[PDB]
Design an enzyme around this catalytic site. Structure first.
Site, PDB file in Angstrom:
ATOM      1  N   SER A  95     -49.905  53.707 -30.773  1.00 34.03           N
ATOM      2  CA  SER A  95     -49.067  52.548 -30.937  1.00 34.03           C
ATOM      3  C   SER A  95     -49.266  52.069 -32.326  1.00 34.03           C
ATOM      4  O   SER A  95     -49.129  52.955 -33.256  1.00 34.03           O
ATOM      5  CB  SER A  95     -49.615  51.764 -29.900  1.00 34.03           C
ATOM      6  N   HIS A 123     -44.752  53.097 -22.697  1.00 31.13           N
ATOM      7  CA  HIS A 123     -45.758  52.561 -23.636  1.00 31.13           C
ATOM      8  C   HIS A 123     -47.264  52.421 -23.277  1.00 31.13           C
ATOM      9  O   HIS A 123     -47.442  51.751 -22.157  1.00 31.13           O
ATOM     10  CB  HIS A 123     -45.244  51.395 -24.434  1.00 31.13           C
ATOM     11  N   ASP A 131     -39.837  53.354 -23.505  1.00 33.64           N
ATOM     12  CA  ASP A 131     -40.894  52.689 -24.533  1.00 33.64           C
ATOM     13  C   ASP A 131     -39.824  52.159 -25.536  1.00 33.64           C
ATOM     14  O   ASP A 131     -39.171  52.792 -25.953  1.00 33.64           O
ATOM     15  CB  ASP A 131     -42.002  53.476 -25.042  1.00 33.64           C
TER      16      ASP A 131
HETATM   17  O1  LIG Z   1     -45.710  44.702 -35.397  1.00 29.37           O
HETATM   18  N1  LIG Z   1     -45.348  45.496 -34.814  1.00 29.37           N
HETATM   19  O2  LIG Z   1     -44.297  45.854 -34.982  1.00 29.37           O
HETATM   20  C1  LIG Z   1     -45.915  46.262 -33.800  1.00 29.37           C
HETATM   21  C2  LIG Z   1     -47.179  46.438 -33.622  1.00 29.37           C
HETATM   22  C3  LIG Z   1     -47.602  47.478 -32.723  1.00 29.37           C
HETATM   23  C4  LIG Z   1     -47.089  47.507 -31.639  1.00 29.37           C
HETATM   24  O3  LIG Z   1     -47.711  48.172 -30.269  1.00 29.37           O
HETATM   25  C5  LIG Z   1     -45.656  47.049 -31.475  1.00 29.37           C
HETATM   26  C6  LIG Z   1     -45.118  46.709 -32.651  1.00 29.37           C
END
Ligand SMILES: O=[N+]([O-])c1ccc(O)cc1
Ligand SMILES: O=[N+]([O-])c1ccc(O)cc1
Length: 299
Positions: free
Chosen positions: A149, A273, A243
């Site tokens: 992630s 996810h 996800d």
């Molecule tokens: O800040 N972002 O774009 C995010 C950062 C982490 C995530 O798991 C999803 C989106």
């Protein structure tokens, strides 16, 4: 397309703060999963790396039997705001013992207290430390970076910066990474409510991590924007079918492949996810076996 995995379906059906409270709630969820499906015993040693942005705590995992000749450096996920070495122990312990690899799990600085691009800098510095230490562990000085992630974002950015930073990287393992904070994809539009990782959460994570809205277009925030991917480290890109981040992950894998980067792209169907830190799902161990199989081909 494909039906939800049955255990995933049941998990979603059974689902139901200050920043400190939210961080504790995230840690409590991780503990509960580890209590349901205990991690393998593994030898570990704690330490602290001196980075250009301050001390960064690490934990080194030592396999029962060392079978892989590069150290892994692992960056946990959690939106840049949540998570730590303990929340991701279940995954890292299994990576260590199944791959038979030394793994350095990194406690990088969290947002909003630290903002973009501080954790990127830290993560580079820790990878460099590991590359310098590797020979004294009987290993090659080229490292494998990994993360889930937000951690997969960091792994991808570290990999893009590696040559410029004189950092030797043998491979990158991206588990459902965030890679493109600018563009909406079909998955991001269609799966952003009800599948654990939510639109509102992702917006809030960006508000905590980024300095200003303009940072979304910076390649160290959005590595999918980088036009030249040639010569980047061999890549394993694992995605989940349901996800919101799926499509940017898979598109990045396609771009790497077309740029002549040795790339393995695996979608776990019917998954959500976060599944590689959710040991209630057998797909977590399947994906760890995918890691081992991929890393067997690096040397
Ligand atoms: O800040 N972002 O774009 C995010 C950062 C982490 C995530 O798991 C999803 C989106
Ligand atoms: O915190 N901020 O300055 C932000 C960050 C991201 C965004 O989309 C809007 C504002």
């Amino acid at each position: 397309h494909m039906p939800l995995d049955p255990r995933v379906e049941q998990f979603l059906a059974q689902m139901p703060l200050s920043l400190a409270e939210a961080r504790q709630q995230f840690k409590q969820g991780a503990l509960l999963l580890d209590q349901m499906v205990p991690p393998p015993p593994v030898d570990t040693e704690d330490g602290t790396v001196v980075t250009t942005h301050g001390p960064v705590r690490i934990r080194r995992y030592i396999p029962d039997r060392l079978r892989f000749s590069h150290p892994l450096v692992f960056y946990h996920g959690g939106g840049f705001v949540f998570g730590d070495i303990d929340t991701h122990h279940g995954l890292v312990a299994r990576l260590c013992q199944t791959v038979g690899a030394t793994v350095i799990s990194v406690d990088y600085s969290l947002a909003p207290e630290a903002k973009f691009p501080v954790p990127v800098a830290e993560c580079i510095d820790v990878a460099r430390w590991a590359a310098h230490e590797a020979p004294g562990w009987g290993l090659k000085p080229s490292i494998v970076v990994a993360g889930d992630s937000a951690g997969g974002n960091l792994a991808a950015v570290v990999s893009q910066r590696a040559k410029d930073e004189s950092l030797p990287i043998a491979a990158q393992l991206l588990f459902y990474p965030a890679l493109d904070m600018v563009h909406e994809t079909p998955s991001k539009r269609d799966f952003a409510r009800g599948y654990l990782l939510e639109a509102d959460a992702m917006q809030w994570f960006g508000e905590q991590y980024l300095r200003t809205p303009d940072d979304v277009s910076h390649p160290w925030a959005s590595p999918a924007l980088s036009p030249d991917l040639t010569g980047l480290p061999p890549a394993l890109v694992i995605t989940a079918e349901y996800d919101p981040l799926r499509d940017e992950g898979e598109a990045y894998a396609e771009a790497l492949r077309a740029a002549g980067v040795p790339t393995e792209q695996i979608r776990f169907d019917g998954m959500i996810h976060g599944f590689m830190t959710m040991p209630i799902f057998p797909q977590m161990e399947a994906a760890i076996e995918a890691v081992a199989r991929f890393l067997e081909r690096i040397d």
